[PDB]
């Protein structure tokens, strides 16, 4: 489970694409997670196509074969957290976005 | 004419049985009647694709 | 309103057993379309999967490949509890443990998404 | 199977074995029953599932009228033509599935005999299993009811196939 | 030797399917009723006969239709020979 | 109205042939959706099946496993009869024989039900 | 071919269930036969679901897997006969009911 | 396969292997995903594909009238009965195909393991491939992702079949 | 079969053999013909099977009226929407079967070559049968027309499989 | 590729049937060709069921398994040419008709 | 209108190469639903097939079994040309050669019917 970014410093309101390469080509099982430091991680988008509860409209995902991208329409100062990519039982190494 | 039966469907040609789901006797019906169609025969396959010999 | 508060001491002797109680409030353990995973997170490797349990007419258990012979998950119906028991602890297991609830299902199949997490730390000598 | 048998009346699927004791014909009774239930199930939805209507509009007229009589002749004609197409689509769809399930059940029984004789018989390409091994009529019937054991005929048939 | 076969008929019927039009099937059942008994029977429904009287004539009190007084029916049958002999 | 009267003597020498004629009135042997079985009944083993002879473009024959090599059934169209021929009789066959008509079919398949039976006894020395 | 009852003495108007357990699970081939002593038998219900010609309404049958039950709604003094069960070519040992 | 497993929640098709190291259960993730996309595609055509109609005729009446009121009660009843049958035929057709495509997917996964195990395993009848060869859990998982190589286990398993 | 061939125009199915004499491509002609007759039969029921109607009600209006004009605009709209759905269901059902029968024909041709090569060839996974036996181009064409004999290549290929 | 006739002398207006028996049973691939001596050939009927461009209505074909017949309703003095039958890549030896 | 005029000399030395140019007017070689065959006709063997070429995103070539290792067909796009090149000619090849257009397709499949032929003779010493 590999993720293309590791640590980035994007400006406020920027559009960032986080691409998570997988090994097995299946889309309805993978999800996306976000963990603030010292806080319980939550679920934003599940099955890579539909957002979860308590999620704003600026979070969107895409599915193309074995490639899955989590796109943020506008970066916010409250969105400083580490992002995680999980397919079925294996989690990604992490994605630290910064404002 | 007027006779005796035990049947629900009534058509101007006379009473008809209502076991089959389709009929083409007449378009005027009364009671529990099969739906009117234009075709005369509608065979339903209840067997296997037949090959001779 | 689903709330999960997990308890348990976070200071145990190495090469011993381990206890972790995950109390559940607002939801019942006996649920057809919901499982209960167990996820630990470390600064070295990151998030990883350990095992899961649910109830389909009988308490079923699954475990990961690495901790297959050392992890037992004991559910409880009496007071809404799922208990984690780790045997033969090792000082490489100095990590935080999260009790989270699965069951965001499509067509009745648990796809492995986790909701309603908790909080809990653990360190050993 | 190139062609079927003219004189098989106790089932749709069966076998015609032939060995040194003679040739016999027996009908399979399990796959034939499964095809009957799938066929009788289709007739259950159609037979005796009618709807009742008591009072309708007049559908035949004697004196010619204006707009209202032309509308009643068009509503009745719309319902008849739509239901005539629905009857054609329902029968043709059901006939397509009935033939397909019947042909698939024939191939399923062909696989079951081959799966049971995993190492003692192979396909001859004519829908037959040429077996010269010591398999009498009771041995043939053991295949029919699924009680055939290939362990007692494994070593006895592997050497004979290399000989013949 | 352990061959496989299937039942066949010297004279089967022809049904219509999605792909083909003239496929041959061993046994086919009729689904469209194209025959009638010939008489209207009155056992489940109360059927009232016309007897050369229409509904309007029996409603107004036609003297030749005096038998249909205070009568009820489940289906009125009007004959094709109905005629009125009263005031126009 | 289907009526089956079977004839034939009921006293034969053992280790000999046997004759049994089943005359048929009201129905013809040349029937596409019908078959004609032969059933014998004894106080000891009970009802058992022997064979049948239907008509698919020419007279086909079937027989049971036990009396496969001793029973021949000969149909005839001349005066609407069916003849039963048993060879090499045995004094264990001291039982009554029934000529019955099969052909209570569903979807064109003969289901093995028997209708319009007959009556006839047989005993040997 | 196994039948649970062999001989019974039920009162007039009783309900009796005769179970004919078979080996192969198929329902459209089995039938039921009744033979009064001294004459030819007859067919009551065929394919274990539909009664035959000349059969009263008090005879009913059921099909459940490999077990088939023939039920009489009300026993009659004219129904004293041996009952036989046939699957495809094998007949049962018999079932003697008595008033 | 006579019957399924009561304790499988993460997939529709899977394996329950058993060897000297114990017994494990792992869900297949490729064939289960393909069945979801064929099922979710069917729901895409139905959900959110409605048509809008603003002004229609009166469908309920208070005062009884003559011919015109009887015609309006017959036009509305014709549309309801035709759409009721169309809804019955649409659901029953998709339910027939959904089960039929799924049972084919179960057989396709059964064939893929047999095709991969071309010379080292044979069918048993119940689906449980009795293998005594030196094939551990990582060897079992090599079959799952299609990375199993039969060349390194060809000569090691052919002699074991003759031995056992 | 992972993917199709870009350069086959004379048939929907075919073979691309390769041996010591080179590589050739010949399209199948029997299975392609059988797929054409099933597709052409489907077009026979639709093309030229129309029904004629001469006198109908007015379907467009200029002056606005009361109840009768609203009823005529509702009867015509009901017929159009019902036939629009019937056209959608008929095309989608025939498109589902046409793809399914076409995808089933390529598996039957794959099975026929494996059935003919009963003891001389085995499946590899990609469809390419790796054969090193003395089977030239005329030998390849013997498989194509069903005239290939496995008896003359039984002992000549069994030893070659153990050698390679 | 065998053809039953090789040379015939039919009268003007006669009906002639030319049989082209093949080996592989397929009907949508076979065609029919006409070649006058000293000119390029043309296509009369393709797929054995539908005539081509520039073909009169007196030319008809039939398909029955592996048997294909080309029938002329009325022979003409301008139809003196050698007829050829092609299935997919093999042409017939020829069919010389004469008035 | 489709018109095919093929050129090329009809007198070549045996055991040499051969050139045959089939000029095309009114139609283009780059066509999805059309192939271009090459048919020779001899007084003894008769009509026979040699090869074909078309364009499905790349210039594909096919050849017969007998002249597989001696025939090369070279299409051209610049001036609407298809060229036939025969190598190692033999005096048994004294026959006329026809450049004809295939592609009378049904359902997108080229059924092998030929339209819009040409004219051309060839004889060698
Ligand atoms: C096919 O598969 C789908 C998906 O797996 C099933 O849909 C689920 O169905 C179950 C029950 O059939 C639902 O579970 C119950 O939902 C109730 C209301 O749901 C709302 O709230 C949940 C969050 O809880 C939302 O996700 C959902 O979208 C709705 O907005 C809850 O009230 C139930 O709570 C239970 O537990 C509490 C614990 O305290 C008790 O107090 C309650 O009394 C109750 O017992 C329960 O959670 C589930 O929500 C459905 N999921 C979805 C996505 O719709 C189909 O039912 C299934 N079909 C068949 C035929 O099996
Ligand atoms: C698909 O399969 C079904 C079931 O096998 C067939 O239905 C049978 O069809 C045959 C002939 O097509 C029927 O046989 C004939 O029936 C006539 C009238 O049937 C009534 O009487 C019988 C009892 O005889 C009842 O069982 C039945 O329910 C009806 O009430 C008889 O008059 C015929 O008699 C023949 O023999 C006498 C002998 O003297 C002659 O005098 C007559 O002229 C005549 O030749 C004959 O018995 C049979 O009854 C049908 N069975 C049922 C249950 O309906 C379908 O026909 C078949 N479909 C196709 C397309 O093949
Ligand atoms: C499914 O498969 C069928 C049959 O294989 C296809 O039908 C063919 O479609 C192609 C194009 O899609 C057609 O080719 C073009 O036809 C145009 C008009 O066709 C008329 O004329 C031809 C004779 O040329 C007749 O056979 C036909 O019946 C029509 O009467 C031509 O004008 C085109 O000419 C091209 O080349 C000239 C060369 O100078 C250019 O000037 C033109 O601009 C143009 O580029 C061309 O020939 C072909 O005719 C169709 N065949 C039939 C039998 O109908 C379907 O299209 C295909 N469907 C899909 C979705 O792929
Ligand atoms: C049931 O009764 C109805 C009405 O009495 C019959 O409908 C009408 O039947 C008559 C005579 O059968 C038809 O007249 C003739 O029709 C033919 C076409 O079939 C036509 O060519 C003749 O010139 C003549 O008009 C009449 O058209 C028909 N009407 C309708 C609306 O169908 C019906 O036939 C009877 N059905 C049975 C089974 O008896
Ligand atoms: C299966 O059929 C054979 C055929 O003779 C028989 O010997 C065997 O007893 C049968 N098995 C069962 C369980 O009926
Ligand atoms: C049965 O089919 C044959 C075709 O070979 C035909 O000659 C015969 O007339 C048919 N008989 C009946 C009764 O349909
Ligand atoms: C009208 O019906 C009545 C009752 O049957 C009958 O008496 C009378 O004669 C009928 N009218 C004519 C003109 O026949
Ligand atoms: C396939 O699964 C096995 C199971 O252990 C593993 O060893 C192997 O690396 C996997 N292959 C790939 C390409 O992921
Ligand atoms: C089948 O094809 C091969 C290929 O060369 C050929 O030799 C053989 O004669 C063909 N058989 C028939 C019956 O055409």
Residue numbers in the entry:
A (entry chain K), G (entry chain F), J (entry chain L): 4 to 91, 96 to 106
B (entry chain C): 273 to 325
C (entry chain J), F (entry chain E), K (entry chain H): 1 to 35, 35A, 35B, 36 to 52, 52A, 52B, 53 to 82, 82A, ...
D (entry chain D), H (entry chain I), I (entry chain B): 10 to 173
E (entry chain C): 12 to 99
Q: What are the paper's exact sentences on this?
A:
We also assessed the neutralization of these three signature-identified antibodies with a high-throughput influenza neutralization assay using engineered reporter viruses, and showed that two of these three antibodies (SRR2899884.46167 and 39218, paired with MEDI8852 light chain respectively) showed comparable neutralization potency and breadth to MEDI8852. The cryo-electron microscopy structure for one of the signature-identified antibodies in complex with hemagglutinin confirmed motif recognition to be similar to known HV6-1-class members, MEDI8852 and 56.a.09, despite differences in recognition-loop length. We also showed the 46167H/MEDI8852L antibody, of which the heavy chain was identified from the sequence signature search, to neutralize diverse strains of influenza A and to recognize hemagglutinin in a manner similar to that of MEDI8852 and 56.a.09, despite having differences in CDR-H3 length.
Antibodies of the same class share similar recognition modes and developmental pathways, and several antibody classes have been identified that neutralize diverse group 1- and group 2-influenza A viruses and have been observed in multiple human donors. Another example of a multidonor antibody class is the HV6-1-derived influenza antibodies that target the stem region of influenza hemagglutinin with extraordinary breadth.
